[PDB]
């Protein structure tokens, strides 16, 4: 039942997509006229590519560009547009297999296929892989840690894994695996596995990797690289302030290497997550110099070199939170962080 690790047996699906598009450019062309392989690339050039996310969700409040289009659909008017594209789909419909003739005659009637293409492929290698992908998803849906990674560990040794669920079940399985590994390692191995510092979107028929859940290093954030930083700050928090340390610095220098290109380059949590790691580094230093005036009765301890190191940092953080707002970052509820930071300043006094 679940999402499979592999390029989709490219055989009938590629010619079903010819007939689908070729009809859509034919029927649409005559809608454009009434208003007054390559076809598939032209269909996407007529509706653009998919930004770095999922569904071109964007507000729902700005432009009230009125659509009352007058329903404009008189059964009689639809069959005027349709009567000629269907006879031009029969030319290519004849050269197509008997299975693809009716598949086209089903989708051109508006029927949808209850025939999951991944419910017929009969290829040994593929065969199993569907069993393993479903096995591991039914095992994390009951938290079976000792069996879920056995299935996970075998699923990647078989030639059919594109990061895919490997990066999305390979991390939790390591959070649920109380034993060996911190999705982190696996997360940092992924980051190096798919930097994709190259800005590639659009162009060709992404039909092998179409999930904003692997890819990027162009603009479109990688979400395993954002999860690597988020899991890393949460891995820094646990049992700090409750020279072998370094981690909150390691994370300050592992974003420093970035400082925009693709990540710096693109805004948000990149900036925000960085400030948040930085804000935590300011609190720890107020604790390590907090309780009952620093530790206790005063400091005499050479004025307060430690207050100046912290005020520099508080002033720096406020710069990172501000540039993350300015550059269009909707992520941060500024009111709460500023109140927290000022009430914390009041601990440093």
């Amino acid at each position: 039942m679940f999402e499979v690790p592999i390029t989709l047996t490219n055989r009938k699906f590629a010619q079903r997509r010819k007939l689908k598009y070729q009809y859509i450019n034919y029927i649409s062309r005559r809608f454009d006229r009434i208003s007054k392989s390559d076809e598939e690339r032209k269909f996407w050039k007529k509706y653009e590519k998919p930004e770095k996310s999922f569904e071109i969700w964007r507000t729902v409040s700005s432009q009230n560009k009125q659509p009352i289009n007058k329903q404009k659909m008189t059964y009689h008017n639809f069959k005027k547009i349709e009567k000629i594209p269907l006879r031009k789909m029969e030319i290519p419909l004849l050269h197509c297999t008997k299975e693809n003739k009716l598949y086209f005659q089903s989708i051109s009637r508006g029927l949808e296929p209850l025939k999951t293409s991944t419910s017929e492929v009969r290829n040994y290698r593929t065969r199993h892989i569907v069993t393993l992908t479903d096995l591991l998803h039914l095992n994390v849906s009951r938290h079976n840690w000792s069996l879920a990674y056995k299935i996970f560990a075998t699923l990647i040794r078989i030639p059919g894994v594109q990061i895919k669920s490997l990066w999305g079940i390979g991390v939790e399985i390591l959070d649920n695996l109380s034993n060996s590994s911190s999705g982190l390692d696996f997360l940092q191995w992924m980051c190096q596995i798919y930097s994709s510092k190259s800005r590639f979107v659009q162009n060709i028929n992404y039909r092998s990797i179409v999930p904003p859940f692997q890819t990027g290093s162009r603009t479109h954030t990688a979400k395993f690289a954002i999860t690597y930083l988020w899991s890393s700050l949460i891995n820094c928090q646990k049992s700090m302030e409750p020279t072998e340390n370094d981690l909150l610095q390691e994370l300050i220098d592992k974003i420093s290497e970035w400082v925009l290109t693709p990540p710096f380059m693109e805004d948000a949590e990149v900036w925000f997550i960085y400030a948040s790691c930085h804000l935590l580094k300011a609190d720890t230093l107020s604790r390590q110099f907090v309780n009952d005036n620093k530790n206790n009765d005063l400091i005499g301890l050479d004025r307060d070199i430690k207050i100046n190191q912290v005020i520099k940092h508080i002033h720096y953080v406020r710069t990172f939170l501000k540039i993350c707002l300015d550059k269009g970052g909707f992520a941060v509820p500024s009111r709460l962080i500023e109140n927290q930071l000022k009430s914390f300043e009041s601990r440093l006094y």
Binding site: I193, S195, S196, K197, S198, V259, L260, F264
Partner: protein, 109 residues
């Protein structure tokens, strides 16, 4: 750091397209003031073959054995200001390999 003060001292470099416009015909063929906000330096990394690869930290032992420079990519956040503010453009430009001082705040050691 000092280098950002330096770029704060270079200021601006302004150029006018002889904005024709048909004062609008000799009072600005549209101002374009270009400057540099930040300058970034990264520790030596090496990508294999092309770039579509994940980079590795480059160590001095490597530069000596290879008998080559120990270079860091120099980057600088370019500000492209158009018509005094009509258009702002940011660019992280790679300025080739800057020889980095060993054991510096920019050397892995």
């Amino acid at each position: 750091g000092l280098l950002n003060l330096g770029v704060k001292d270079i200021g601006e470099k302004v150029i006018f397209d002889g904005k024709p416009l048909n004062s609008n015909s000799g009072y600005l063929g549209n101002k374009l003031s270009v400057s540099v906000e930040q300058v970034s330096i990264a520790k030596p990394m090496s990508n294999d073959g092309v770039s579509s690869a994940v980079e590795r930290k480059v160590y001095p032992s490597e530069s000596r054995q290879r008998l080559t420079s120990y270079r860091g990519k120099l980057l600088l956040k370019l500000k492209w200001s158009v018509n005094n503010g009509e258009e702002n453009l940011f660019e992280v430009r790679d300025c080739g390999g800057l020889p980095v001082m060993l054991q510096s705040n920019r050397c892995h050691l």
